[PDB]
Every structure is written in structure tokens, then in C-alpha cells.
Paper text:
[name] ([name])—the eukaryotic sliding clamp—is an 86-kDa homotrimeric ring with a six-fold pseudosymmetric rotation axis running through the centre of the clamp and a central channel lined with lysine and arginine-rich α-helices through which DNA is threaded (1–6). The front face of the [name] ring contains the site of interaction of polymerases and other proteins, named the PIP-box binding site. The [name]–associated factor [name] (hereafter named p15) is an oncogenic, 11 kDa intrinsically disordered protein that regulates DNA replication and lesion bypass via a PIP-box interaction with [name]. p15 co-localizes with [name] in the nucleus of proliferating cells mainly in the S phase of the cell cycle. Thus, p15 outcompetes DNA for a common binding site in the clamp channel, and the stoichiometry of binding dictates the available sliding surfaces.
Residue numbers in the entry:
A (entry chain B): 2 to 254
B (entry chain E): 53 to 71
C (entry chain A): 1 to 254
D (entry chain C): 0 to 255
E (entry chain D): 52 to 71
The structure:
DNA sequence: CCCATCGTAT
DNA sequence: ATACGATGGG
């Protein structure tokens, strides 16, 4: 398996997003590309990364490998990589090893790191096809700020999806707080827009702890898509360029 | 951000998904 | 009733950073004339007096005179939510234990509104008088900020000596001794960067650097500070707030 | 009577003392007509540092006899941190006080700090430094070298510098895995300043503790270039030059 | 981010190389 | 060269 | 749980 990524800063961004939520996880390499799917320490939330081979330069995969990586380990190694560096994954089928090679732009420095793989009992989970009562698309940043701000009011947030806009509310010791995101009538902020596909109205409750973890992915995308129905796991999705996506799953009240 | 806890009333993702 | 619409919301935010390390809870005094606040520090060492004149707000309406008991640490955490470019509005009803802070972003798109629980505070408002002052230094807020930080590393008290020529600040301890001499500005094109002295009598007072360093958390409100001093009398550090009012600290010399 | 040394570019005195303070608690400055010298071992007696600021580099330099000032560098650092980076710093001492005066004139010309620090009595001991030919001598960007030592500090606790004709390689290992950084020699690109140059006589493959290298790199602000200089079982010399004023040289013994 | 790694057992001091 | 973000120690 | 210094961006 060999995979040359021009924009190396992605593999770096990905691993910051994940490492607060997952210690160790199984990368599933195939001709089609790189997939990953894990639950959190606490078995509360679920993350699924999907990076399609189309998005790499060199992509070659002979057999389907299932590499057990320690994400905290792999992050510390990836933090070495320059953000403008051309990153390449190489792994030799046999061996408990994954090679990350980093070429800098001057073409005159080249790092290469070998990290020790793990054997992982990957409890394979099966994420159903669902239609969704509501689906907000909004700026990753905006959503990030809301979750940070309301984390100061209380420990749960109440997302109310409606025809004309979305509301987020939280309460506690200090008081109460309501944040009302109206819909963008298109052609403004430039992309910095809020769009809604509301079939059935919803008011769901979620713990802000986990939302605030999921938002660590914010660097990957200027847009986040929240997708909801009564007592069915909310799906926070960050799309990765033209290459894949990252999806979080959290069960509501 | 203020350090949060996980509500007692949280369900596991196990009760929604499986193999 | 009371509603007060502030276009430049970053001021209400700056105010509350300046206060929150010095005062836990305090009584806001709302009136037709505007917003006044006056508290001592937890430790009964210093006093702060905030004055925001109604003229400085956009909308200001205040029926009768309310005395709102706010927890400043609480109100800060809520104001930290507000974007710095956001249009902040205070609303509070008569007979009521709550103050509403509404924050509209510039995009016109996002709007926060927070409700905080008020408390009952008896506070026997001091009464500060006009006083004449042996010395009055007017200098850059930054300069003064730096001096207090630097000397805080030498020890825990600073010695402000006012003279005709200039002002001097000295402190001593473990490391050694340090003297910082601010001469008066000869040219001074700009206020931002000038040192001015109004010396009547010479003075040498001693103050705790702990409190000075608190007072300097107000530095964002003004490019200028004014220190004002007399032989047996609380120093007054004063930060003026753009078209709105001022913030004044009072510290009694050691 | 008196020593006085007026440095227009004050940020140097500041930079020097950041470079030294993680390595040395207390040391004897050797002040003389010729200039300011310092030569100390570290707390643990592992490495050696030799600072040399030549009088020609100061604006005012006057030294009436030789002083040997015992300074507490922790103290002197905290005092120098007060000085603005654009400040005109002046070091002044009489033969008849136990004290060193650091006076700071800000660039605005209306503010002036002056600090008085107490000197100390230091039973020193000055090491003899022998003339030495060097199997290898890398000259590279201070930054590059800084990054390498930081990065590999995350792999483990020693780094293996292999010098060859073609280029230099740095390798380290530990719990997580293994790590190799190959720095090939520069033909050019922009223009000196950001080049890798090698003076290889004999190939060398030496092992060094990353703890100490990472201390030495705290000097990086003084120079855009560093020079590593190496031989079988002979202390490595990391050297930062200080703008036609002097230099700073660290000495660390390799694995044997 | 910089790791301050302990001082290797195999470290020699500069004392054994230079003297008064 | 000043302002904005990060990380630990009390 | 809150303060105060350390690091990086513009």
C-alpha cells in the first residue's frame, strides 16, 4: 500500500480532529481508498472517516489491509510534518509498521517515520440508511462558536429546527441562553450561509461535551451539515475537499 | 469552553447501531 | 423599565474584563442620566467607580431608577459569548430579578439573547468628592501598564515620586532595585504617546503592585491613563471611555 | 575606576541571556579591555558554553581594569526581560561596588530604566580548549537544525548525526518507532543565508543527547546560521555567531 | 511542543575532555 | 513591532 | 477554577 498526498495538511487536520475522541482505531485500506470507523473511549459517539483513492496522487493497494494505529502516536509523528509538506503513506502488507514520508518544498529535506502497528479487535458496526426530518448546512465556525458559548451556560444544548431558522438553547446555574440562526436568502457572506431542509420540525437535546469534541474537525471544512430526526443519532458531517468526509454520530436525549 | 460532564440520561450508540 | 442599545458592544465587554478580577458582585445604578457603578474590592483595599453617560448609547430609556444586583463574574462569562463587532443591548424590567443581554451580529443573521439572575445588594454607596491633587501624570496606558508589570518582577510595592521634571517609579527586592524615569514630553505630536505633568507640591507615595496591575486590565478602554496623587490621600488611576464615560480606580497608599 | 558598555542593539544582550539561562544558573563574566567573555559548564557538568562579545561591537566600551563579575543568570534574565527590545542597554560597574548596573533607554528617548543587581562570589575554574581538526563541519540554517532537534525529541532521547559527502542525516528511535531526516547539500536557491554546506574530511556517525541539543538551540535567535563540528570521540561544537561582535559556542560530548 | 527528554546514562561530561 | 492564542501551575 | 506567561501570526 502506497498513497501520495500533495496537500499533506489534510492527514494532519484529520488526526487532530480524531485524537481527542479515539485512542486507537483500525484503518481500512482498499483499492477504493482509506476508511476508518470507531467509537469513542466512552462508547457514546461514533466517527467514520472516508478518504477516496481519487483524491490522492499515487494510490496503489494490492490487498485489503486493516492497520491498527494508535492515533495519539500517529498524531505526534504527523505534528513533525511541515504543513506545506508532501506526505506519503507506505506499508508492506506483512510487517507491523506504517511509513509516513514527508518531503519539504525546497525538495532538499525529506523525513520518514516508521510507527509500530497494533492488532485491533474491531467491533464492526453497521450504520443504516436514514431519511432525516431536518438537515442544517451552516458555517463550521458559527457552529463551533455556538457550542463554545453555550458550553458556558450549561452542559446540554437544545436544537430546535423550524421552517425559517434554527435555534440552540442551554440553561444552568448562571441563567439561560438562546442563539437564533436565521436562513440566508442566498447570495451573501459569500458561502457563509445557513440552509435548511426541514420536513418534520424537531426539538432534540444533545450533550455539549461531545459536540465540542466534534468541532475539533472544523479546520477541514468551511461548512458543517447537521442532520436530525426524533430519537435517532444526529450526524455532524465535515466534507474533506473533493476527497472524502468525516462524520460524527451522537445519540440525543 | 467550560469543562462539561456526560449526562446520566445518555444512551450508548450500541442501542441504535450494530453489525 | 430600562433599555440601552450600544452599537460598539466591545466596550461593555472591555468594561467587564477590567472589573471582574477586582469585584465579585456589585450594584448597577441605572437612571435617566445613565449607568453608574461603585464597589470596593473583596479585600477592602481599592474602590472602582464606572460611569457610562446615557448620551453615549444609541437607544437609552429608563423610567424609574433601578439598582440591579449583578454578579460580575457571571455577567463576564455571558459577555464573553458576545462577538466584539456585535450590537449589544441591555433590557431589564422593574420589579424583576433578571437582566437581558441581547447580541446582534453585523450580518443581521445571528442573534443571541441571555438571561442572567440578579441578586439583592444593600451597598451603602460611598460618596466620592472632588479633590485637588499635588500631582497629575497623564501618560500612555501602555507605558504605565509595562512599568507596573516590569516592577512587579522586582518586588511587591512601587514608589511613585512626582517632581517638576518627571515621574519616577521604583521597587526593590530579592533580585535588586529598579528605577524607571518618565521625563515630560517636549514635542508630543499626538496624545497617544505623550507624558504631561501638573505638579503643584512634590509627592512620594508607596503602593502595592498587586492592585495596580489589576487596574491596568482596563488599559484596552483608552490609549491614555491619568494618575493623580496627594500626600495623605488615595491615588486615582483613571481610564476615560470614548464618548461614554470613564472608569476610575482608587487605591490608598501603603 | 569603571567599566561601561553601551549596546545600541539591546535585543542582543537579551537574546544571549535566554540562550544561557536554561543551561547555567550562575557564572563569572570576564570583562576586560578586549570585551566580555563568559565560559561555564552547565548545572550537571555535561556541556560547556563559551560566549565572546568583542569590545569593537559595543558603542561605548570602557574597561579600566579587569573585572570578573559573579552574576546570577536567573536574576540577570528576569531583569533583562524588563528591557524593551528596541531599548539601548548599557552595562556599568565600579571596582568599588558589589553590583552591576543595567540601564535601559527606550527608543522614544523619554523613558529610562536602571536596575542594580547584587554580584556574587564564584569559585570558578576555566577549562582549556584544545586546537582540533574536525572530521565534519556542517553549516546549516539555525531554524532547520532547531526543527530537527525538536521533532526528533519526540521520537526519543538521542539523535544520530551521520555526516557524508552528499549530505547529513539525523536519526532517532524509541517507543513510537524510528525517524530519519536527510538534509542534502545546497547548490543554491535564494542565496546564501539558507544553505547546507559540508567540509567532510572523514565520514562520521556520532550519537548525542537531544536534551542538551535542545538547550543549545535556544540560541537560535542570535543567527540565521548554525555550524556543527564533529570527530570521533571528541566534543561536538554547536556555534552561533553574533553579528561581527562575537559568538556563542556550545560543547557536548558524544556517545562513547 | 518540545519534549525535554532525560539525560542519557551513557553521557560523559566535558570534564573528561578539557581541563585547567 | 504589537496583538492574539495557548498551556501550565497554583 | 482562574491567573499569568509563552508562543505564533500579521
Amino acid at each position: 500500500f502506497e498513497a501520495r498526498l500533495v496537500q499533506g495538511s489534510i492527514l494532519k487536520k484529520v488526526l487532530e480532529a480524531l485524537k481527542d475522541l479515539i485512542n486507537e482505531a483500525c484503518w481500512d485500506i482498499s483499492s477504493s481508498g482509506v476508511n476508518l470507523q470507531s467509537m469513542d473511549s466512552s462508547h457514546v459517539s461514533l466517527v467514520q472517516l472516508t478518504l477516496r483513492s481519487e483524491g490522492f496522487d499515487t494510490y496503489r493497494c494490492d490487498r485489503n489491509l486493516a492497520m491498527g494505529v494508535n492515533l495519539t502516536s500517529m498524531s505526534k509523528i504527523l505534528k513533525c510534518a511541515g504543513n506545506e509538506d508532501i506526505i506519503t503513506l507506505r506499508a508492506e502488507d506483512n510487517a507491523d509498521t506504517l511509513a509516513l514520508v514527508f518531503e519539504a518544498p525546497n525538495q532538499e529535506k525529506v523525513s520518514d517515520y516508521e510507527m509500530k502497528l497494533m492488532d485491533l479487535d474491531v467491533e464492526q458496526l453497521g450504520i443504516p440508511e436514514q431519511e432525516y426530518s431536518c438537515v442544517v448546512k451552516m458555517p463550521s465556525g458559527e457552529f463551533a462558536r455556538i457550542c463554545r458559548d453555550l458550553s458556558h451556560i450549561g452542559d446540554a444544548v437544545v436544537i430546535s429546527c423550524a421552517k425559517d431558522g434554527v435555534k440552540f438553547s442551554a440553561s444552568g446555574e448562571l441563567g439561560n441562553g438562546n442563539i437564533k440562526l436565521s436562513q440566508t436568502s442566498n447570495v451573501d457572506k459569500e458561502e457563509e450561509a445557513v440552509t435548511i431542509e426541514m420536513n418534520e420540525p424537531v426539538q432534540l437535546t444533545f450533550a455539549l461535551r461531545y459536540l465540542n469534541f466534534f468541532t475539533k474537525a472544523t479546520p477541514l471544512s468551511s461548512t458543517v451539515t447537521l442532520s436530525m430526526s426524533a430519537d435517532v443519532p444526529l450526524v455532524v458531517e465535515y466534507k474533506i475537499a473533493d476527497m472524502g468526509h468525516l462524520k460524527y454520530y451522537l445519540a440525543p436525549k | 469552553v467550560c469543562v462539561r460532564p456526560t449526562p446520566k440520561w445518555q444512551k450508548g450508540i450500541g442501542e441504535f447501531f450494530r453489525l
